[PDB]
Design a binder for this molecule. Sequence first.
Ligand SMILES: [Mg+2]
Ligand SMILES: [Mg+2]
Ligand SMILES: [Zn+2]
Length: 73
Amino acid sequence: SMQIFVKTLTGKTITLEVEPSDTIENVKAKIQDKEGIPPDQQRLIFAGKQLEDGRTLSDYNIQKESTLHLVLR
Ligand SMILES: [Mg+2]
Ligand SMILES: [Mg+2]
Ligand SMILES: [Zn+2]
Protein backbone atom coordinates (compact mmCIF):
# COMPACT_ATOMS: atom_id res chain seq x y z
CA SER A 1 0.00 0.00 0.00
CA MET A 2 2.82 2.39 -0.96
CA GLN A 3 2.46 6.19 -1.02
CA ILE A 4 4.46 8.63 -3.11
CA PHE A 5 4.34 12.42 -3.43
CA VAL A 6 4.32 14.75 -6.43
CA LYS A 7 5.24 18.44 -6.00
CA THR A 8 4.12 21.03 -8.56
CA LEU A 9 6.26 24.08 -9.29
CA THR A 10 4.19 26.31 -7.01
CA GLY A 11 4.57 23.81 -4.18
CA LYS A 12 1.34 21.82 -4.26
CA THR A 13 1.76 18.29 -2.93
CA ILE A 14 -0.24 15.42 -4.48
CA THR A 15 -0.37 12.10 -2.63
CA LEU A 16 -0.56 9.00 -4.85
CA GLU A 17 -1.23 5.34 -3.99
CA VAL A 18 1.10 3.21 -6.12
CA GLU A 19 2.79 -0.24 -6.42
CA PRO A 20 6.48 -0.42 -7.44
CA SER A 21 5.30 -2.26 -10.57
CA ASP A 22 3.20 0.71 -11.75
CA THR A 23 4.47 2.35 -14.92
CA ILE A 24 5.10 6.09 -15.18
CA GLU A 25 2.17 6.31 -17.62
CA ASN A 26 0.05 4.83 -14.82
CA VAL A 27 1.32 7.45 -12.39
CA LYS A 28 0.35 10.19 -14.84
CA ALA A 29 -3.09 8.62 -15.14
CA LYS A 30 -3.40 8.80 -11.35
CA ILE A 31 -2.18 12.42 -11.34
CA GLN A 32 -4.74 13.22 -14.05
CA ASP A 33 -7.56 11.94 -11.80
CA LYS A 34 -6.39 14.25 -9.03
CA GLU A 35 -5.27 17.36 -10.98
CA GLY A 36 -6.90 17.24 -14.40
CA ILE A 37 -3.68 17.48 -16.42
CA PRO A 38 -3.82 15.09 -19.43
CA PRO A 39 -0.96 12.58 -19.25
CA ASP A 40 0.64 13.85 -22.44
CA GLN A 41 1.18 17.28 -20.85
CA GLN A 42 2.97 15.95 -17.74
CA ARG A 43 6.71 15.75 -17.17
CA LEU A 44 7.80 13.80 -14.09
CA ILE A 45 11.35 14.20 -12.73
CA PHE A 46 13.04 12.27 -9.90
CA ALA A 47 16.66 12.72 -8.75
CA GLY A 48 17.41 14.93 -11.75
CA LYS A 49 16.21 12.42 -14.39
CA GLN A 50 13.15 12.83 -16.59
CA LEU A 51 11.06 9.71 -16.12
CA GLU A 52 10.03 7.70 -19.18
CA ASP A 53 6.42 6.62 -19.61
CA GLY A 54 7.37 3.01 -20.37
CA ARG A 55 9.49 2.35 -17.30
CA THR A 56 8.16 1.40 -13.88
CA LEU A 57 8.68 2.99 -10.49
CA SER A 58 10.90 0.09 -9.41
CA ASP A 59 12.95 0.65 -12.60
CA TYR A 60 13.91 3.94 -10.88
CA ASN A 61 14.20 2.71 -7.26
CA ILE A 62 11.34 5.04 -6.36
CA GLN A 63 10.19 3.82 -2.95
CA LYS A 64 7.70 4.65 -0.19
CA GLU A 65 7.26 8.42 0.29
CA SER A 66 9.59 9.44 -2.55
CA THR A 67 8.87 12.86 -4.01
CA LEU A 68 8.52 13.30 -7.77
CA HIS A 69 8.46 16.72 -9.41
CA LEU A 70 5.73 17.63 -11.89
CA VAL A 71 6.20 20.12 -14.70
CA LEU A 72 4.06 20.78 -17.74
CA ARG A 73 4.62 20.69 -21.52
MG1 LIG B 1 -2.18 0.18 -9.57
MG1 LIG C 1 -1.45 -4.58 -8.29
ZN1 LIG D 1 2.93 8.67 -22.37
